[PDB]
Design a protein around this ligand. Structure first.
Ligand SMILES: *[C@@H](CC(=O)Nc1ccc(C(=O)N[C@@]2(C)CCC[C@@H](Nc3ncc(Cl)c(-c4c[nH]c5ccccc45)n3)C2)nc1)CN(C)C
Lengths: 65, 281, 298
């Protein structure tokens, strides 16, 4: 009867997108502007911009109609 | 996101030959209307003439968007230009006049991209009298449901601009070979504008477009970025994919080469022809 | 058009909703006709159209159609038999732990998908959680939903119906992430537990009062940059009632879930994915299979 977690498997058709918490160690976040305190305070980090930008770059890159 | 979007699904096409078949039938469908409404007369535009007209009025759509105040997101403009392209895949410029529809396209796109501007500040950007400006508003409001209907209510447009910022993040991070990938910007941005004048936006994905733009810029800059596509995008591993990507990015460079702008003389005569359809019908 | 209005179901602010049957097919549908006069088609009918054509998930409402004339547009959805607020305020219904598990599961799965596709719902509350007659919960009312993750993009507060509004949105934060849906998920959980609105304020400052009375006034430790939000006015150091005193029927699994949802830091507030991987959902008992969830016979 138990529910068991299993991630959403959504085919992005391009390169591997690095994990949101990995972005600061993989060094991506040096290449977006820092979120300011008010943005941070609202739950808005620079990692969100970076993560979305990278996903936008890699989405559909190896798709053909 | 692009990979499950309506853009991918219904609005990205397998070749220019598919597009020409849509536009051919869009002109043909009209002629049966105007023949029933009226005769195979010389008043009617040919599909290539409509392509000149759509190419002309798309450059007017970009004028209106470049001189627009407050200012305008490229997102809004790209969405407008995309609606303009998409409108004119299944509709004839002789039923819906492109001057109107280009403003219905900017109007719907201002709303859909959540860019705040009201009906008075909107038509306040038309170089007309307040009579003409408020006449324009009536036609914009009459056509706005028709625009949305012919878009099949697929109002989200995935533009190359966010992809383009993604590749710039990536190249600075994990291709230190290109010591400053920022310099590729203006040229890639210029190339994007040119890709936008072609059918590329109905043919390639936003990312493929943004990548072609960046690499076209790097090649023009005397930089080779083979090790970026092979190593970093991991097609040193998957081989059939590296060829397929290069076949896509090179098919796009051909479009920006085999594009010719609207000729002013042709545009003048074609506007004449168009307005004789629109005084009637 | 090809629909016959059968019954009036309600008013939103922006629309009035009716049961119809589409003559072509055995979908009973909720048509949400928009109400009006020179701005064109309503920006809220567009907002729902633009966002719902893109998403597809069993725990998000399926936009079937749209249609109209001039500036006046219908949006058409599957008719849902009930909603979560009706279930909450039905005194004869008993919400067992499995039942509360089964609703909170579906909310979080719907919301996991939604956040993955970079959209905040921004109006989560129990009447915006519709439940069908097969017992799947779907998020509905996308009319205030917005995409996030854009740095150069100011958003508004006054999103969420005050009672389910997160303290960063009561402090009027311009930029915000998924925390604004996660707080509302906490407020909906608390309401499935208590059967009354958890924090029923009646000014935006009476909302911050009832949050801080109940969950304690946030320290800087619990919210480092709270202070830089525009409307940040300092409060009395309200004690906070410990969560097992509020929800005394809860087990430490569920109290960990609830706690994670109510974190003041909108960055530390558990995401929908983090939430689904907590021991609460995998622990015994298992979530009620949607077929067995309680159906209000009026
Ligand atoms: C006996 C008598 C009885 O009580 N019967 C009832 C009571 C209520 C309903 C009913 O229709 N309830 C609602 C109105 C509850 C909210 C959701 C409604 N369905 C719906 N489906 C899709 C959409 Cl998009 C919407 C929708 C979205 N926003 C709104 C705002 C307001 C209203 C609707 C909205 N709604 C269903 N049915 C029966 C009962 N016997 C013994 C069964």
């Amino acid at each position: 009867a138990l529910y068991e977690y299993q991630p959403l498997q959504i085919e992005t058709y391009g390169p591997h997108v690095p994990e949101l918490e990995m972005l600061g160690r993989l060094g991506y976040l040096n290449h977006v502007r820092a979120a300011s305190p008010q943005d941070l305070a609202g739950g808005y980090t620079s990692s969100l911009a970076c993560h979305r930008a990278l996903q936008d770059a890699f989405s559909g890159l190896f798709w053909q109609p | 996101m692009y990979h499950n979007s309506s853009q991918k699904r219904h609005w990205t096409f397998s070749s220019e030959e598919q597009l020409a078949r849509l536009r051919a039938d869009a002109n043909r469908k009209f002629r049966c209307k105007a023949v029933a409404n009226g005769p195979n007369d010389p008043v009617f535009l040919e599909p290539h003439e409509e392509m000149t007209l759509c190419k002309y009025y798309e450059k007017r759509l970009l004028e209106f968007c470049s001189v627009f105040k407050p200012a305008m997101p490229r997102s809004v403009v790209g969405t407008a230009c995309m609606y303009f392209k998409r409108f004119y895949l299944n509709n004839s410029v002789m039923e819906y006049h492109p001057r109107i529809i280009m403003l219905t396209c900017a109007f719907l796109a201002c709303k859909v991209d959540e860019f705040n501007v009201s009906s008075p500040q909107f038509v306040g950007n038309l170089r007309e009298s307040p009579l003409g400006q408020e006449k324009a508003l009536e036609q914009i409001l009459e056509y706005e449901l028709l625009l949305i209907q012919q878009l099949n209510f697929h109002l989200i447009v995935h533009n190359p601009y966010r992809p383009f910022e993604g590749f710039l993040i990536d190249l600075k991070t994990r291709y230190p070979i290109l010591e400053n990938p920022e310099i590729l910007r203006k040229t890639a941005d210029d190339f994007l504008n040119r890709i936008a004048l072609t059918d590329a936006y109905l043919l390639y994905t936003p990312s493929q477009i943004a990548l072609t733009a960046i690499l076209s810029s790097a090649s023009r800059a005397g930089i080779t970025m083979e090790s970026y596509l092979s190593e970093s995008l991991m097609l040193k591993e998957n081989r059939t994919c590296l060829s397929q990507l290069l076949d896509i990015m090179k098919s796009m460079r051909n479009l920006v080469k085999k594009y010719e702008p609207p000729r002013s003389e042709e545009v003048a005569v074609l506007k004449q022809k168009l307005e004789r359809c629109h005084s009637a019908e | 058009k090809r629909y016959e209005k059968l019954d009036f179901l309600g008013e939103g602010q922006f629309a009035t909703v009716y049961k119809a049957r589409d003559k072509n097919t055995n979908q009973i549908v909720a048509i949400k006709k928009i109400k009006l006069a020179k701005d064109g088609i309503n920006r809220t009918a567009l907002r729902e159209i633009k966002l719902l054509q893109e998403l597809s998930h069993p725990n998000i409402i399926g936009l079937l159609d749209a249609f109209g004339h001039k500036s006046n547009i219908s949006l058409v959805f599957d008719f849902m038999e009930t909603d979560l607020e009706v279930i909450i305020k039905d005194n004869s219904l008993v919400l067992t732990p499995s039942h509360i598990k089964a609703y909170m599961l579906m909310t979080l799965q719907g919301l996991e998908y939604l956040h993955q596709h970079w959209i905040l719902h921004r109006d989560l509350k129990p009447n915006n959680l519709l439940l069908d007659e097969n017992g799947v919960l779907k998020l509905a009312d996308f009319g205030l939903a917005k995409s996030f993750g854009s740095p150069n993009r100011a958003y508004t507060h006054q999103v969420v119906t005050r009672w389910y509004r997160a303290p960063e949105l009561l402090f009027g934060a311009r930029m915000y992430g998924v925390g604004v849906d996660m707080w509302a998920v906490g407020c909906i959980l608390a309401e499935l537990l208590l059967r009354v609105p958890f924090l029923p304020g009646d000014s935006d400052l009476d909302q911050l009062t009832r949050i801080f009375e109940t969950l304690g006034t946030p320290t800087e430790e619990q919210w480092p940059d709270m202070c830089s939000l525009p409307d940040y006015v300092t409060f009395k150091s309200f004690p906070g009632i410990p969560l097992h005193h509020i929800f005394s029927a809860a087990g430490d699994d569920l109290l960990d879930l609830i706690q994670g949802l109510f974190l003041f830091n909108p960055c530390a507030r558990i995401t929908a994915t983090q939430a689904l991987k907590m021991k609460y959902f995998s622990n015994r008992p298992g979530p009620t299979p949607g077929c067995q969830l309680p159906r209000p016979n009026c």
